[PDB]
Amino acid sequence: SHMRVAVADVGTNSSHLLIAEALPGDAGGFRVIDTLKDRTRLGECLDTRGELTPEGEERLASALTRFRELAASAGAGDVRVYATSALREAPNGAEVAERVRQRTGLYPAVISGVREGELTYLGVREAVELGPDNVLLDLGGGSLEFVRGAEERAADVLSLPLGAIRMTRAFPEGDGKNAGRDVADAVARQVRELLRPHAGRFAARPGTQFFLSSGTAEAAADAIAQRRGGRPAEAAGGVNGERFTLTELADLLAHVARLRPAQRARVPGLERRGDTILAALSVLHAALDALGAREVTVSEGALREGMLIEELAQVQTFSLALSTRQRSVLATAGRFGVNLSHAGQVAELSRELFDRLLAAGETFPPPARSLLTAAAVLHEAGQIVRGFGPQDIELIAQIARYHRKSLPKPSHPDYVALAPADRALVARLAGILRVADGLDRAHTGLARVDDLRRQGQGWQLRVSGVTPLDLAGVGEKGDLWAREFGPLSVQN
Ligand SMILES: [Mn+2]
């Protein structure tokens, strides 16, 4: 009876899914419907050259299919999937992602570490109480993000190759009695080396609050509470918002370093994380200590909650700037079961491309922009192959379902032949619409047109926020653009 949305993130240790329903009032809020975690362990499926092995590909695809079936179970539809360090850093990442889409329909789109921090920071904001000056450390299996901001959003973000999986493999544990201490000591030195040039950006100042997210930080809080006399985090509901001190953090690591690995699996609260936990806890202590932290709060919110906020922000921001007639287009598309985020992004990019063409001296009729907006919103309505007149809606439908071969053949009855100027208009506006659809082929909502310039008889389009799938999609669907506007080279 209300919008249901699915977002998921693919990390280095595990993958995480969130399905939620928007809250009424278009206030950018959501109600949680369901959550899932997947032990993908890509960081353990990376060969010596940094490539994801076929085993990781099998494990990735399986995760995204679990995700794909659950979204349907909740009427959520499409799943937006972002990918971080393992896929970001794998030389074969793109090929793995392209293969996974073919097998699952879902594409793990890589984002930079910096966007990971910003989105992660928003997700924490949904879970805990932030103040005027906050530093977040997000330790995953692959990387460590540092994020500083205030009560609403991230300001400065740093991503470092200090992930837990990465550091465990980088500092192999010896067999001495003190082999554990030596590992913890060595990991702590690497942290200082890489963090030293930037730590001031994230160093504690009077009143600063420190926060931790993700499974290692969550795991540390559970073990610390059970050592303070508390019950396991499953009891007490969850671990969200628990505080512990740097001294308590220091005390937990010392116990682990003295134990051998099989006994680490038997520490209360660390039962499912024994293999990387020594290095992960060395990472947390050194960075917090290097920042001057004395006490932290753990957040169960992370990357996926931020994705949810951002998509709602994108959709609802789009909705405000549309006319009542255009607002009725989005609802109709909604009644057709279309993806509004995809529809909104394609329409925004279409306007972006239309406007640059207009600025460059292209001539278009007055209602052209209106028709393109609606067909961009309607381009994925399967039923049709509220405020618009009948020539215009036939134009829109013909723009929305354009093909070089017209579905009804020209001698065949019911062939709909618009006037010559309208035939020409359909082709020009349809050519614009294909490039924009290609630019959000990956459904990231992240693409933007930066610069579109004439280059001889053609055009050169500079875009940001594009995935390899988006860039190849634009290459594939601009054939009509080429017939009407000339060769297009896309860059960056
Ligand atoms: Mn589409």
Automatic annotation (TrEMBL):
- Ppx/GppA phosphatase C-terminal domain sequence ranges: 325-450
User: Does the keyword field hold Chloroplast?
Assistant: no
Say if the entry is tagged with keyword Hydrolase: yes
- InterPro entries with a match to the protein in the record: ATPase_NBD, GppA/Ppx_hydrolase, HD/PDEase_dom, Ppx_GppA_C, Ppx_GppA_N, PyroPPase_GppA_Ppx
Residues annotated as binding Mg(2+) are H342, H379, E380, D437
Q: Where is the Ppx/GppA phosphatase N-terminal domain?
A: 26-313
Give a single Pfam family match: Ppx-GppA
Q: Which keywords label this protein?
A: Hydrolase, Metal-binding
Named from the GO MF annotations, one term is: pyrophosphatase activity
Residues that bind Mn(2+), according to the entry?
A: H342, H379, E380, D437
Name of this protein: Exopolyphosphatase
Q: Which organism is it from?
A: Deinococcus radiodurans (strain ATCC 13939 / DSM 20539 / JCM 16871 / CCUG 27074 / LMG 4051 / NBRC 15346 / NCIMB 9279 / VKM B-1422 / R1)
What lineage does UniProt assign to this protein's organism? Bacteria, Thermotogati, Deinococcota, Deinococci, Deinococcales
